[model samples]
Target: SPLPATHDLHISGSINGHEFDLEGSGKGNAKEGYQELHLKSNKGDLSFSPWILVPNIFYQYLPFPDGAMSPYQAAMHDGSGYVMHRSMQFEDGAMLHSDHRYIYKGNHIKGEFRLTGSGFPADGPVMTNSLTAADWCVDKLLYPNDNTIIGKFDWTYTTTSGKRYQSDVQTNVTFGKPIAADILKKQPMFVFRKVELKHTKTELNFKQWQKAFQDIA
Candidate 1:
């Protein structure tokens, strides 16, 4: 095989202020494996996607980074690195759901992502650019809290001359394919962000796009 749908993504930050530095290796997903797989803890899930913001119709919930963590089990299980707040709005708010919470204080946390916000898109349009490889990278910035440092991929585009172009993207998938030392010595060192909204099957049909976002009322 050609090594299973190889695709990579290297991103940069600064959205509202404008400053992006996209990397090479274009295109994404041609069908790969491992996602929401708990098959006896086989490890899976971890991806933020297109940085994320809102509008332009839901974005596949942004899955395609695929869980990971094994910098030697993130420096041998460093303590106090897992603080997961939570979410679930939409009374007028946006995130009808939220929370992934895979905090590994050190690194190499070999797969463990819970799940988060979604409506559909991940790249938009029946979800193209599946983004196969490029497993993981989170230098801090887990949604609501974590006090920012090396993560931000907000999105909002529309400059057909009218205006409205505020996009800040950043994703550094350093390298991929590793953490296979017998599944990183059977991972799971107590650090969970496991919580779901309504029902979860890895973001399948979010009320058919919340009924097309309420048919624009």
Candidate 2:
């Protein structure tokens, strides 16, 4: 029996006292544990599209807070704990960059992650908003094949005028059943080989918009 290649999940969370409802879905080769998530918000009508590549082997390893190592550390002997990369391209022409780290906590494999949004200003600006996350965790150990995850996170959005908004958020993801044959399709496990940036023009446009906005009020 072959399951559907895609599945839908639920995403409900809050940021800065604003409630958000999102439609979540994912599709990929389940055996590889690598997939892409599509998230669309209903309240703010915003989009955060993230594609993640999760590797079975040690992609990178970093020492834990207590100087400990997981049994599945990367075999390459790299002295960093970052094992995977996560990327997001937002609807507002902003971007997110982050890395994934793995550790063991009470027979569970957890992810320690951080994300930096592109809304940040270069040095100083009035009414500028910056989005950042810390202590984000995702359950990957116990239900490796279950297609569901639960985690907690903290996020902060700050303005230059000493206005701060923050929250401790929780996330729950339930993926649909995996298509049986999709696992045999032999998709590429790595998202990138050599990285290059050719978006200087778009970045400049963003900066211009930021400057223009800051000039008002």
Candidate 3:
């Protein structure tokens, strides 16, 4: 069945002189349900369901093209069509975390971000790597308009050259048209998964070579 329609969110913003506008199809809220096992020991329940679920808290926006990118903006855009701005905390934690994901098509960010100082900085620098980190923060989320969002970020990024930059960056986002209903239908009401980390030979080849030399000597 088609769930109730929530607010159709919109977003607009500029990063490094490149402008963007986007919109969402609308989303719904959810509550959890569970099943009971016929018999059980100290193992507890056979399955657990969430007590509450807020699916599609975010939706895709209009594509921000590579053609519109300036050299510096391109560096930051790094091939992505979406951005995320939110404030949330883990079920097990106290200090709230403000999280932002930029660029890429979905569920991932191709760029690394950093920020510093006590709060949002008026401006900061961008680089591929500082061999370290960038400034960052967790902040309150705001909706200035029905379609707009405002928040602060904590970022820490390091350049390949061993330089580090950090800041509290204030960011704003707004969006455009409803996303396809079919797309939303396929979306999950809840997700549970493990995080996996993989390593590539290209990134570790030099270290491997170093280890070989040490072993030989």
Candidate 4:
């Protein structure tokens, strides 16, 4: 991963009235595409272990004028990845154990968590809103393949006492400039790979969008 994670990803909101702010950068290039990406927020630092997802910022803006994903409608739909231990850390001293969520019906890292109403929906649950909205994600991550809920399972939290906890929250997401073109590409997992996701019925809203793209399956 010689390329440095450059694109700025920002998520901000409140959980139980606690304000949280997160900011991170993505690293990519035309040759390798989005090789590395991550998030370090008040909630915790999260990394896309398999580094696969198409953040909505690409939809908001990108392509270098000659990039390969202009069709945009179908490409960059969504995908799956993982966030391991320490993936989420709340200021309340509650930490998230996502592997638990993943191993025992948890969230598998995937999709554009940034809730601009442009990316996936499962991702909103994590933050005040953005992280778990992708719960369209962690649900896939935390919940079993047949779990009745649609991408709502995000993180398995442990308070300082090491007890399990979950909470409802609201969050706001913001996008920074796309990666540096001179050194980066409009390259996203779905677009760079020419893949798409499938969809299904849900309250979150994106499982349907993922349907045609082979996403969310």
Candidate 5:
């Protein structure tokens, strides 16, 4: 059969600590393997917001280590392994609460961090105190899906020890699947085409307002 209209659909992604992107187009003549757009995410934070996912495209941050690729022969090619990512706008969110904790399950990538009320949380309402996190995985270039439990991302709102009553809300979530690409392809154009990740200092904190109070005797 004629090759599926394959083009070097640029793939890119980043999360946790890794950051990178691929520039190679469809492997035109190289017929060893086909990159199945794994996962793709943008900088957004919301429950029902629109997100674009792609297939065959690769992510930048590779979460799992080399051990995961030993079983697959295809993944063993080219010495370079694989990478994946699932993201949520975890941009500049602060480390407000002390309840933040992350654990990497034996079968999945994990991450956890706190936001302080004195920093971005203390700045102002509707601020960019949001987060964009992700997890990536890898396999021998010979095996595409041999590796699992690549990585993860968590974004939330909470409070500190002193400001526990004002607004202390915490939520939890876990993403399991066949990568973002296969998960979000219902909306043709809405599908992801490329991943552009930026790694910089978390983000700025919220503005401050000083007010002195007198004690009643």
Candidate 6:
């Protein structure tokens, strides 16, 4: 299995421009003291690995093109999405999804991600293409090393082909140890651009997105 060494680790981090005051039950609160986070909660395992070995990270949103929804009615358009959000951490045999959901009053859209999770299986790197996947890995830019894996979130723009090319904002986490570097280099990156596929916007509960994300990796 692609599962890493399991542990009940507590991870917490801010959403950059967003306001989130996350706390934990005990030690390992990422926001409280962690300068970096290289783990993810998925498949009820709370998986982890050294910062160096993570790879091709990607996230996806749900209830798209085909009108996808779960049996639990998690994709409701109601305001009570928090409980559904928490449920995402461990839904089905999986815990999270390959997508991250962003909901702000008038703005609600699912983000397909890449490279947000740290570590890879050697055979399958965390990312196949950073440009397309726009994976939101933890802050990898803050480096104590020579090479810097900067998340080019600024790469979002309109392509000459009259298409939208974009990437998500990279989260706050750094991977500088030698082990981290070796693993990152071994992983192939992925890139994503908006296709001409005409479709309406879709919505997913945080849980559904979380579950889908964890299962993909």
TM-score of each predicted structure versus truth: 0.22, 0.27, 0.25, 0.26, 0.18, 0.20
Ten contiguous residues with the weakest lDDT in model 1: 205-214
For model 3, the superposed segments whose C-alpha errors exceed 4 Å read 1-129, 134-136, 158-164, 177-217
Sliding window of 10 residues with minimal summed lDDT for model 5: 204-213
Q: Please, what are the lDDT tens digits per residue for candidate 1 over residues 100-174?
A: 223222221222223234444344421232322211212222222222212333333332243333323332221
Order of candidates by lDDT, top first?
A: 2, 4, 3, 1, 5, 6
Q: What lDDT does candidate 1 reach at residue 143?
A: 22
Winning candidate number (TM-score): 2
lDDT of each: 0.24, 0.29, 0.25, 0.26, 0.24, 0.23
Residue-pair clashes, model 3: 47
User: Which regions of candidate 2 fall more than 4 Å away from where they truly are?
Assistant: 1-4, 45-217
lDDT value for candidate 6?
Answer: 0.23
Runs in model 6 deviating more than 4 A are 1-148, 153-168, 191-205, 208-217
Instruction: Sort the candidates on TM-score, descending order.
Output: 2, 4, 3, 1, 6, 5
Comparing 2 with 6 on lDDT, the higher-scoring candidate is 2
Q: Judging by lDDT, tell me the better candidate of 4 and 5.
A: 4
Give one digit per residue, the lDDT tens place, for model 2 in 84-194.
343444233444444445443322233444444454223322112222211222222122343333333333333335544343333333333331232213221111111
Q: Whole-model lDDT, candidate 1?
A: 0.24
- Alpha-carbon RMSD of each model: 18.1, 17.3, 22.1, 16.9, 19.6, 20.1
What tens-digit string does per-residue lDDT give for candidate 5 at 94-200? Answer: 22322222232222222222222222233433233222321121111211342343222232223222221122222222223233433222221111112222222
Name the top lDDT candidate.
2
C-alpha-based local distance difference test score of model 2: 0.29
For model 1 the TM-score comes to 0.22
